[PDB]
C-alpha cells in the first residue's frame, strides 16, 4: 500500500490509497509490459479461522468467490467542517491502517497537536487476535514505564518489524494549507501557490 492526499485551490480534495498488497505484490512481472501483478487474493479468508499475512481472520462473508472484491483495510479519508475540507489523510499498514488513522485523528482533534506532531507521534496496534498482543514499530517502540505497565496488565508487546504506517496528510485552516509527511517514510509535501 501507499497513500497520497491532494487539495486544489478550489477546495476540492482527493485521498487515494492503492496497493499491490504486499511489497512488490506477487513478484510476477507481465513480460513485455514491465509491471507487477498484485497478490491481493491473500486478503480473502482462505480457510475459516486461519490468519492471513496481516494476522486477520474471516469466515463466509470474506470467503473467496468469483468476481468478488476481497475485504480491505484501506481507508482514504477526508474530514470536513462547515462544508469545507479541513483534513485529508490516509496511510498504508494493512490491518493497522484504520487504527493508525484513528490515532492521528485523536492526536489532531482531542490532543490538539500540530499536524506534524500528530503524524510523528508513536502509534500502536491491537486486533483481538493474536490474543492481547500490542504491536509497535522500530520507529517509536513501546519502552520504559508504559511498556512495563501494559505488560503488568497482561499484554504481550511485539515489534511488528515494519513501520506502523506512512501518513500523508493535508490540513486546511481557513484558506491556508499545511502538509505533513510521515517521518517513517520518504514522503514529501508541498503547498502550491496559484
Amino acid at each position: 500500500t501507499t497513500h497520497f492526499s491532494i487539495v486544489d485551490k478550489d477546495g476540492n480534495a482527493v485521498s487515494n490509497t492503492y496497493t499491490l498488497n504486499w511489497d512488490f505484490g506477487s513478484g510476477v512481472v507481465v513480460k513485455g509490459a514491465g509491471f507487477l501483478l498484485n497478490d491481493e487474493m491473500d486478503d480473502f479468508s482462505s480457510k475459516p479461522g486461519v490468519a492471513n499475512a496481516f494476522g486477520v481472520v474471516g469466515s463466509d462473508a470474506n470467503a473467496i468467490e468469483p468476481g468478488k472484491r476481497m475485504l480491505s483495510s484501506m481507508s482514504p479519508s477526508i474530514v470536513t467542517r462547515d462544508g469545507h475540507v479541513s483534513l485529508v489523510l490516509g496511510t498504508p499498514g494493512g490491518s493497522r491502517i484504520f487504527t493508525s488513522i484513528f490515532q492521528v485523528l485523536n492526536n489532531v482533534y482531542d490532543f490538539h497537536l500540530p499536524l506534524e506532531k500528530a503524524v510523528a507521534a508513536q502509534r500502536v496496534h491491537h486486533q483481538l487476535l493474536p490474543k492481547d498482543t500490542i504491536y509497535y514499530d522500530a520507529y517509536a517502540p513501546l519502552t520504559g514505564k508504559v511498556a512495563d505497565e501494559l505488560k503488568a496488565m497482561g499484554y504481550t508487546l511485539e515489534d511488528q518489524g515494519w513501520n506502523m504506517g506512512d501518513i500523508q496528510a493535508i490540513r486546511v485552516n481557513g484558506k491556508a494549507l499545511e502538509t505533513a509527511s510521515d517521518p517513517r517514510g520518504r514522503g514529501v509535501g508541498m503547498v502550491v501557490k496559484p
Binding site: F4, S5, I6, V7, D8, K9, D10, G11, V88, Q168, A169, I170, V172, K175, A176, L177, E178, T179, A180, S181, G187, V188, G189, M190, V191, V192, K193, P194
Partner: peptide
C-alpha cells in the same frame, strides 16, 4: 484557498 497542496 491560498493555493493547492500535495502530500505524496
Amino acid at each position: 484557498l491560498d493555493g493547492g497542496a500535495v502530500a505524496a
